[PDB]
Structure 1
Amino acid sequence: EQSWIPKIFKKKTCHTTEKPTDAYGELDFTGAGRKHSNFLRLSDRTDPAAVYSLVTRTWGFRAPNLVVSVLGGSGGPVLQTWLQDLLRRGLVRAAQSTGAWIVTGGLHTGIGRHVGVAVRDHQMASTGGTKVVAMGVAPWGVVRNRDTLINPKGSFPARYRWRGVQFPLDYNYSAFFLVDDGTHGCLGGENRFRLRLESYISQQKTGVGGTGIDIPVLLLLIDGDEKMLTRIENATQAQLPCLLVAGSGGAADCLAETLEDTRQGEARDRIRRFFPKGDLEVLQAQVERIMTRKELLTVYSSEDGSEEFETIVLKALVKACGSYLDELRLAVAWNRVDIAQSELFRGDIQWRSFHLEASLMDALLNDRPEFVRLLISHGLSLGHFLTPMRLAQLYSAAPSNSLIRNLLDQAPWSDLLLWALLLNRAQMAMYFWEMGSNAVSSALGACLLLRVMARLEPDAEEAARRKDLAFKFEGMGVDLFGECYRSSEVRAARLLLRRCPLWGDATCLQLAMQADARAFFAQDGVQSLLTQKWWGDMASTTPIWALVLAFFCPPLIYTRLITFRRCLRRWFHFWGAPVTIFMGNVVSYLLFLLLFSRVLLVDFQPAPPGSLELLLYFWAFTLLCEELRQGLSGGSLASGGPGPGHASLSQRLRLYLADSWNQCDLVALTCFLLGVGCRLTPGLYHLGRTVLCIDFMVFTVRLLHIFTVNKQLGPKIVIVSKMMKDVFFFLFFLGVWLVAYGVATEGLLRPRDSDFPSILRRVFYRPYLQIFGQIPQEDMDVALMEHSNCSSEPGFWAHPPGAQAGTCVSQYANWLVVLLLVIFLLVANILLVNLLIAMFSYTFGKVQGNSDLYWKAQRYRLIREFHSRPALAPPFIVISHLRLLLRQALEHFRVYLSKEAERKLLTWESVHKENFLLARARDKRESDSERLKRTSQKVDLALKQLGHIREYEQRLKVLEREVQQCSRVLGWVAEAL
């Protein structure tokens, strides 16, 4: 695998030399575990920046937040029980709450064996995730079995054997640094590597960018021995780390007594420690070098036990700093919320503004969404916070390298909302939308921007998040509009249609259209607005017959029947509505078909053409012109199309030829041109008629695409195209079963008059008309024909009475023909047709629910097409094109309001939004599964408070017994002596 490890890191032998390093790789214990632990042999006096870069970069460890270092020696008996409680409650629960490390002498049977027991017990007790990591620094020279690790290339698994002064390696850790100095069995022979590593960690920033704090580090000592004071004084003189001294040990309680003062030093150095030591420098150096400063040391409380440990750590680590680190930035660097809870809600110290204003910047970068609610709820106003230098700094952080970094390689709340939407943070984005201003338009725009940016990234793990976040925004927008349509439908109609300035001159509805949001058109209020849009200017659900009677006679609109200086505006309002230009288009098209039929049936003689064909040619030229206008005027940004504004001719040409109906009309026009050019040349008169009669069919079948808009045929026309998965199955099965019957029948009868078309006819075409109730039996039997022998081959022959069935049919074994007829009719008639009915029913009942939604989506585009179309008939399309080429959507697409009504309307909707979110939150709060959780927490609290009451009865009974004994003794000395 890697090979730079024996290139950089060195080792030493038996005043010594330097060589490349062997014996490295992963290590495996044949036990219950989820990973193989890493180890490395390395030489002393190496720059620890390399080994820190090794641990962070190559191996999969995350950069730490807190480095505690257990540093003591008990000598190896079993410890008393409350020390086990301390290491089992305080240095493991805190160490997996925050992502932390534990640096320990990594051998077995040392102080670290108890640490391993505590880690193992806490993993075996419960599973809360994020298993406790630990490194082990140990000297090469006391490990029991060598020669199963050392190999010059290296072993990636390594089986390890305990049985087969030395020590084994413990099996609880995840990293093994083996320092070497050159010896065999010198315990306690490497410390300066450990001190320089511990010191190098505390000058390195945390987080992604270098913004926040330096990593805190602390040395925790329970009882040691007579040389541990040197280890204390080296660190606390050199690098200023905060210390912590566990009370009631046996070699550090001397420091507790000499710090609790604020010669007796000889009284202390022989009472709370090993009395044979030699009072020569221990009283002077190994106490005075420690007690020359006291802002660093801290006595841990012996009367106050566990469940307060990180509070004591936090207080000591703040206190020793002032010999700028604060409390909130350290809390945000961890993930604990309750520390911020107590610090904010506690009324002992009034909080300033600079602390919050600085710490919010560190909260936004490392994606801690639960803290921003606290830091902005009872804190600062954001108008003080957001400054353009700060926002430039926030954009300046780029946490990834491929999404916004690649899109910048080419280069107040909504400003944060775009920032949250670019970098894929869900729990930030919901909060910034909920504290937003323009409610409904922002949701659909967010859905649009996610659907666009989902394409450019390569992976699928990103797309499975982007599509889900887009569905979440679309659903939230749908429910918000549904909770506003309930009251004052005029207000909702005014809200939906208007223009939102934050994204340019675009409306809400067009943004919903270009992102393909099905569920937003799915609901009913949008449908009821599109209905009134489609009835045009000033009509309301007048029936059809009034419209037809108005369109037939123009002096009936000035009267009572239509329902809504004066007349010349009334006449312009009536013909502007789309439901009238639709009727005009349909009437013109039917007149075109009737004229074409009267040309084809009676006329179209071999002659010079005349007026009744020149009218048709003029008509076809106008239809080609209108098709060219629709094509050139110009699709869907959700696919990745070129979008509005300007695009290429090579883009619009590719766009237009993908929708099938215009492709069919183009084919129809070219076939029409082929026929009408065929005719003008002489000598090919018949072929023009033959082509043009077939092309009439393709002109006629387009009369279904026009009626897609209407209400009662809309969801019915679309389903017919999705039922083409079964007609092909029917044709396959029937063709295979049909050809065999045809060949077998014409083999048994043997007609003695044969050609190619007669045989092809009598094999295919005659069985095909037998499944539709036409069964002629004249050519099948012989017992209906005349026994006539006119044939020359030997046998017996019969004469058919019909046509096309030859003139001679054999009679040998004629009953097989009748039996095959019965078999074929029973198969095709009784099984296949009924099976096809069953398949249509089962396909329809499934696909109906999707087809209805897809029809509801496209109705807006089909309405929008008709308004841009010219308002005159194809007999007046020359004058409409004259008005178009004389100077070379507005209705129900922009409503302009007064700004006081705008400012009122946004308040009206913001009230409903703030009501809606609170209603949903309280409905989640008062459910029937969170009652159980709060009762669980309250019963746990009650049990914990009940745990204090028990010992008071024991101590109070003991004290009352002592008072009774003292009263008995005083009464004895008074009245008994």
Structure 2
Amino acid sequence: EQSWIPKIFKKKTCTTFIVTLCQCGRPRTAHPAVATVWDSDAHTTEKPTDAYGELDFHSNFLRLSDRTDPAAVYSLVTRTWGFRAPNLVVSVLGGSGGPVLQTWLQDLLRRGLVRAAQSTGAWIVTGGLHTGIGRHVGVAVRDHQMASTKVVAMGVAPWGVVRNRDTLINPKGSFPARYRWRGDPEDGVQFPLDYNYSAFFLVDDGTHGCLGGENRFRLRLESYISQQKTGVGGTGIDIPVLLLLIDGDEKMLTRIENATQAQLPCLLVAGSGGAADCLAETLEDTLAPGSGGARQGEARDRIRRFFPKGDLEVLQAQVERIMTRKELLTVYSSEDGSEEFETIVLKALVKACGYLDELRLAVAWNRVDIAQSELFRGDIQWRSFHLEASLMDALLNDRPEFVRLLISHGLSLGHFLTPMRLAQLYSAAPSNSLIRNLLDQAPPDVGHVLRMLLGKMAPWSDLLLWALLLNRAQMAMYFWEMGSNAVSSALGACLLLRVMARLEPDAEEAARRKDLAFKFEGMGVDLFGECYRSSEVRAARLLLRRCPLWGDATCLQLAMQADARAFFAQDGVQSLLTQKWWGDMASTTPIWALVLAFFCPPLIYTRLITFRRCLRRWFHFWGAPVTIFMGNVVSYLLFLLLFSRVLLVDFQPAPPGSLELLLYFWAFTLLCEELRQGLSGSLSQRLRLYLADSWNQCDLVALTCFLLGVGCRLTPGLYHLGRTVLCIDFMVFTVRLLHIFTVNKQLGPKIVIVSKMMKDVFFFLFFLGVWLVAYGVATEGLLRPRDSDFPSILRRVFYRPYLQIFGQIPQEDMDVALMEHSNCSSEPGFWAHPPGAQAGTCVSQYANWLVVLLLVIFLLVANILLVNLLIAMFSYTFGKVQGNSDLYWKAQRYRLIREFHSRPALAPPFIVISHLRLLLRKEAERKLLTWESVHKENFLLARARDKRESDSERLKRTSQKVDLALKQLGHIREYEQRLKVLER
């Protein structure tokens, strides 16, 4: 950070000296050995600066030569030092003879200037010294900051006047700096730096003290800053820079003349004092009569300014040169202390310019109220391009308050938005942004970006798309309210934000996109809820309709792909899904009525089921998702019954019989249906998705074992292995009944919760496994059975203790008091013969009281402590995950219902017919949109009214009204007292 600063900025030394004391101010003796009229350029040499650093009273400071390009300085402040670009620069001039100023003057600085600078984010550029107008500005900044409950002020001071210059000098750089501004000596030769200022520019001219050496650099900096553009590059207006002058002297009239030559507005304070009121009276003369007006200026110069130089015509000539460009000069009308600073500044700026517009200045700053007053001015007439140019400035700089106000003032968005205008908006992506990188990889060419994000799935819609991509939350909020399609747009916005959140490199930014997505999803819920309760039929037509602007896809598709669980959880969507679940038949049809019609096809033509006409009714019943689900459930149960019959009875070592061949054909159609679902649900990508699902994995396992088992049974030597695989295979097939019944509303939520319980089960198994190993090995070690076969040892260590949990306690196998004593083993000790077959031939009797004691402890820990602990964890988990599991199933309901809609109407045993058939192969809409929009306005109006009537808003409005009362009361006190004194 500090490397390049000495390289570009050059400090200036005396070099050659002309006189003891030089004309340069340095001592003649204190000079290099190499050392008419002293000249800054001729008598000095430039060396890399050695005073750059950060002060601590943290504030930045730097030493620069007078002949320095302002462009390098501005880049250093904006980029290296981190200071934001100024929306306004107030160059506060002023001599201010005497340490104390008039009360109204100090009031104007603290209340009018500093408050305006903080409100508009402006810069204050004065002398960075604890003297003159610099001290008064500094105390004004400090006083306002304390009462505000930060203003950026820059200080341009000449090096050689700063007290304690040595402590600041460090060629490597002084990032921490120690300064002493409380120096006991008090002299006018040198002054200390002011502690309220944020940055300093110690201009060097090779002098040990002088005033006015930094004027050339200061004027160049102000002129250069006025050439920059406000925000997002060159789109904004030129930065407004104006000079505020209070009192002054003869030298200051030269500064004003130089500023006017540089085309800079000047703001003169009326009644401030000499060198300021002199120009104010000259401006007040304006088009003064020629007779009796030439001498007035000369008399006024002597009257206002001091006696010296009054007789000299240079003062009058300079004033005459000042009036040559009087269009840049304005006088601060006192108005008994108006303190309305910003409006006078606006009048000065617009008058000086004679493109810059008053509305653009309001947009450049963050003062909406100024724009409101300017727009509400009925006398002022605004052209169409005046609003159009201002609206871009609000849009690019992310000012949601301004765009709402500008649109409300009769601005035609249709003519405003042009491809050239749209291109600039997308060029406002800030540096390394997600949209910027996607645009670079992709004229904006935004359409290509959307297709890659969404996957192929009206000026307001385009602006909403632009705001969503740039993550302008408030701007995207406003554009959605003015859009035509709202429910689809809200869900579409959620899909766009969530998919781009997954692509966000910055975790902080991804949170903001997800936060904005939640707001859009909620409003889609609230808006649809308002729409649904007014008319269920019209609300239904809203969801299934295809929105052409997004992807020509229904709102349900957008919600499903955006994982909008809250959108699927409301009653309106669930009721519609139930209606689509039943197809043409009424949603209130009893289940037993459906079952009777299913078994008796002729019954569907009678009146127990409420909905060529006969053919259409026939296809309506058998095409409904519920009847397809029932047909598949009945078929699957028949498949299991056939599988069971073949396994238990029909399976023989002989070649397969008729029933086995039917089972093979039945399983073949099941595989084909599973394959069809995977294919239509990118061959490589589809296969990865299909294998990802756990339910598909068990289905793949189920068919895999069936193929392996069938092959084994056909092999002559592997008949026994064939049945063993099929017996396990039947277990997997039967488990799949849970997956089939996930759609049902009664069993759906419960099945999903069971999966969430697996964490508690694994902990219980781990705790039980540790206890089983400890108890099982210790008991076997104490008994020391004489069998000691490895399968026998494993059975007595794991199998027998496991069964004791479930009430199978073989006391006769582990207790000496129950078995009979025998001298079976020749090994020394006492032995007993258990009666059990697998309990071992003999067991030792040495410490069987410990074996019994271990059994007592094992039963307490396992049968009571561990089991009851699992119940406690199951109860806690069930209560916690009940709400989320219900929401997850409700969101998943649409996918399951849609899946059953695409399934063939024929049962899996007969599905080979349908599989073969699959092979070898408006004004009403506008009225619906208007009806939706009407409800949106009512929903938004109710939300706004509730906020306005909220207790917080009433408290805020009462506070502001009390402020207006205080201002009115204070004016009454001043007016009454003055009138009473005048009338006395």
TM over 0.5: yes
| CA deviation string 1:386-426 (max 9, x = no partner) | 34443344445544443333222239221222112111111
Partner SS state of residue 132, structure 2:
coil
2:843 counterpart (809, 829, 841):
809
2:709 counterpart (657, 675, 700):
675
Alpha-carbon distance between aligned partners in 2 of 1:299 and 1:809, rounded to the nearest angstrom: 116
Mean alpha-carbon deviation: is it higher for 167-176 or for 241-250? 241-250
Mapped contact 1:106–1:135 kept (Cα < 8 A): yes
Q: What's the CA shift for 1:320?
A: 2.9
Q: What's the CA shift for 1:216?
A: 2.0
Q: What's the CA shift for 1:358?
A: 2.8
Mapped contact 2:244–2:266 kept (Cα < 8 A): no
Q: What's the CA shift for 1:518?
A: 0.2
Point out where structure 2 has 5 or more consecutive residues left out of the alignment.
Answer: 15-42, 183-187, 287-294, 442-457
TM-aligned CA distance change 1:165 to 1:860, over 3 Å: same
Q: Which residue does the alignment assign to 2:76?
A: 54
2:650 counterpart (603, 619, 628):
603
Q: What's the CA shift for 1:137?
A: 1.2
Q: What's the CA shift for 1:510?
A: 1.0
Alpha-carbon distance between aligned partners in 2 of 1:230 and 1:576, rounded to the nearest angstrom: 94
Partner SS state of residue 274, structure 1:
coil
1:880 counterpart (886, 907, 914):
914
| CA deviation string 1:419-475 (max 9, x = no partner) | 121111111111111111112111111111111222223111211110011000000
Q: What's the CA shift for 1:91?
A: 1.5
Mapped contact 1:42–1:179 kept (Cα < 8 A): yes
Mapped contact 1:450–1:466 kept (Cα < 8 A): yes
Mapped contact 1:76–1:109 kept (Cα < 8 A): no
TM-aligned CA distance change 1:574 to 1:121, over 3 Å: same
TM-score, with structure 2 as normaliser: 0.90
Partner SS state of residue 234, structure 2:
coil
TM-aligned CA distance change 1:246 to 1:784, over 3 Å: same
Q: What's the CA shift for 1:233?
A: 2.1
| CA deviation string 1:779-812 (max 9, x = no partner) | 3333334444444344444443443334444433
Q: What's the CA shift for 1:688?
A: 1.8
TM-aligned CA distance change 1:157 to 1:870, over 3 Å: same
TM-aligned CA distance change 1:951 to 1:168, over 3 Å: closer
TM-aligned CA distance change 1:377 to 1:653, over 3 Å: same
| CA deviation string 1:122-143 (max 9, x = no partner) | 11112xxx91111111111112
TM-aligned CA distance change 1:555 to 1:930, over 3 Å: closer
Q: What's the CA shift for 1:734?
A: 2.1
TM-aligned CA distance change 1:540 to 1:679, over 3 Å: closer
Partner SS state of residue 269, structure 1:
helix
Partner SS state of residue 185, structure 1:
coil
TM-aligned CA distance change 1:615 to 1:290, over 3 Å: closer
Mean alpha-carbon deviation: is it higher for 512-521 or for 617-626? 617-626
Mapped contact 1:356–1:379 kept (Cα < 8 A): no
Mapped contact 2:246–2:273 kept (Cα < 8 A): yes
TM-aligned CA distance change 1:679 to 1:239, over 3 Å: same
**Structure number with higher helix proportion:** 2
Q: What's the CA shift for 1:573?
A: 2.2
Q: Which residue does the alignment assign to 2:178?
A: 159
| CA deviation string 1:922-949 (max 9, x = no partner) | 1111122222222222222122212223
Q: What's the CA shift for 1:266?
A: 4.7
Mapped contact 1:421–1:446 kept (Cα < 8 A): yes
TM-score, with structure 1 as normaliser: 0.90
Q: What's the CA shift for 1:916?
A: 1.0
Mean alpha-carbon deviation: is it higher for 848-857 or for 951-960? 951-960
| CA deviation string 1:223-274 (max 9, x = no partner) | 1223322222222234353342442413332333333334444533333232
Q: What's the CA shift for 1:376?
A: 1.5
Q: What's the CA shift for 1:17?
A: 2.3
Mapped contact 1:540–1:563 kept (Cα < 8 A): no
Partner SS state of residue 479, structure 1:
helix
Q: What's the CA shift for 1:526?
A: 1.0
Mapped contact 2:265–2:348 kept (Cα < 8 A): no
TM-aligned CA distance change 1:677 to 1:387, over 3 Å: closer
Alpha-carbon distance between aligned partners in 2 of 1:865 and 1:270, rounded to the nearest angstrom: 97
Mean alpha-carbon deviation: is it higher for 698-707 or for 244-253? 244-253
| CA deviation string 1:599-652 (max 9, x = no partner) | 2222332323332322222223222222222222xxxxxxxxxxxxxx922211
Mean alpha-carbon deviation: is it higher for 279-288 or for 792-801? 792-801
Partner SS state of residue 77, structure 1:
coil
Mapped contact 2:628–2:905 kept (Cα < 8 A): yes
TM-aligned CA distance change 1:606 to 1:363, over 3 Å: closer
Alpha-carbon distance between aligned partners in 2 of 1:907 and 1:82, rounded to the nearest angstrom: 59
Q: Which residue does the alignment assign to 1:927?
A: 950
TM-aligned CA distance change 1:625 to 1:41, over 3 Å: same
Alpha-carbon distance between aligned partners in 1 of 2:718 and 2:480, rounded to the nearest angstrom: 72
Alpha-carbon distance between aligned partners in 1 of 2:619 and 2:310, rounded to the nearest angstrom: 116
Number of residue pairs matched by the alignment:
925
Alpha-carbon distance between aligned partners in 2 of 1:749 and 1:330, rounded to the nearest angstrom: 97
Q: What's the CA shift for 1:701?
A: 1.6
| CA deviation string 1:306-336 (max 9, x = no partner) | 33222222222222333x3332122212221
Q: Which residue does the alignment assign to 1:973?
A: none
Alpha-carbon distance between aligned partners in 2 of 1:500 and 1:927, rounded to the nearest angstrom: 37
Q: Which residue does the alignment assign to 1:642?
A: none
Mapped contact 1:218–1:244 kept (Cα < 8 A): no
TM-aligned CA distance change 1:784 to 1:945, over 3 Å: closer
| CA deviation string 1:841-876 (max 9, x = no partner) | 111111111111111111111111122222222332
Alpha-carbon distance between aligned partners in 2 of 1:797 and 1:349, rounded to the nearest angstrom: 117
Q: Which residue does the alignment assign to 1:891?
A: none
TM-aligned CA distance change 1:864 to 1:68, over 3 Å: same
TM-aligned CA distance change 1:502 to 1:681, over 3 Å: same
Q: Which residue does the alignment assign to 1:74?
A: 96
Alpha-carbon distance between aligned partners in 2 of 1:911 and 1:284, rounded to the nearest angstrom: 71
Mapped contact 1:248–1:302 kept (Cα < 8 A): no
TM-aligned CA distance change 1:489 to 1:6, over 3 Å: same
| CA deviation string 1:690-724 (max 9, x = no partner) | 22222221222211111111121111111112111
Q: What's the CA shift for 1:595?
A: 2.0
Q: How does 1:114-129 map to 2 (within 5 A)?
A: 114-126=136-148
Mapped contact 1:242–1:320 kept (Cα < 8 A): no
TM-aligned CA distance change 1:878 to 1:307, over 3 Å: same
Aligned CA RMSD, in angstroms, stands at 2.5
Mean alpha-carbon deviation: is it higher for 79-88 or for 846-855? 79-88
Alpha-carbon distance between aligned partners in 2 of 1:97 and 1:753, rounded to the nearest angstrom: 94
TM-aligned CA distance change 1:406 to 1:783, over 3 Å: closer
Q: Which residue does the alignment assign to 2:859?
A: 825
Alpha-carbon distance between aligned partners in 1 of 2:936 and 2:255, rounded to the nearest angstrom: 63
| CA deviation string 1:143-181 (max 9, x = no partner) | 222332222222221222346922211111121111111
TM-aligned CA distance change 1:734 to 1:298, over 3 Å: closer
Q: Which residue does the alignment assign to 1:259?
A: 283
Q: How does 1:794-805 map to 2 (within 5 A)?
A: 794-805=828-839
Mean alpha-carbon deviation: is it higher for 526-535 or for 515-524? 526-535
Alpha-carbon distance between aligned partners in 2 of 1:266 and 1:681, rounded to the nearest angstrom: 127
Partner SS state of residue 176, structure 1:
strand
Mapped contact 2:467–2:475 kept (Cα < 8 A): yes
Q: What's the CA shift for 1:589?
A: 1.9
Alpha-carbon distance between aligned partners in 2 of 1:307 and 1:695, rounded to the nearest angstrom: 90
Alpha-carbon distance between aligned partners in 2 of 1:162 and 1:123, rounded to the nearest angstrom: 21
Alpha-carbon distance between aligned partners in 1 of 2:272 and 2:788, rounded to the nearest angstrom: 120
Point out where structure 1 has 5 or more consecutive residues left out of the alignment.
Answer: 30-35, 633-646, 887-898, 962-977
Mean alpha-carbon deviation: is it higher for 518-527 or for 183-192? 183-192
| CA deviation string 1:802-827 (max 9, x = no partner) | 43334444433443333333222222
Alpha-carbon distance between aligned partners in 2 of 1:380 and 1:39, rounded to the nearest angstrom: 47
TM-aligned CA distance change 1:416 to 1:957, over 3 Å: closer
Alpha-carbon distance between aligned partners in 1 of 2:434 and 2:820, rounded to the nearest angstrom: 89
Mean alpha-carbon deviation: is it higher for 556-565 or for 441-450? 556-565
TM-aligned CA distance change 1:317 to 1:728, over 3 Å: closer
Mean alpha-carbon deviation: is it higher for 386-395 or for 74-83? 386-395
TM-aligned CA distance change 1:392 to 1:765, over 3 Å: closer
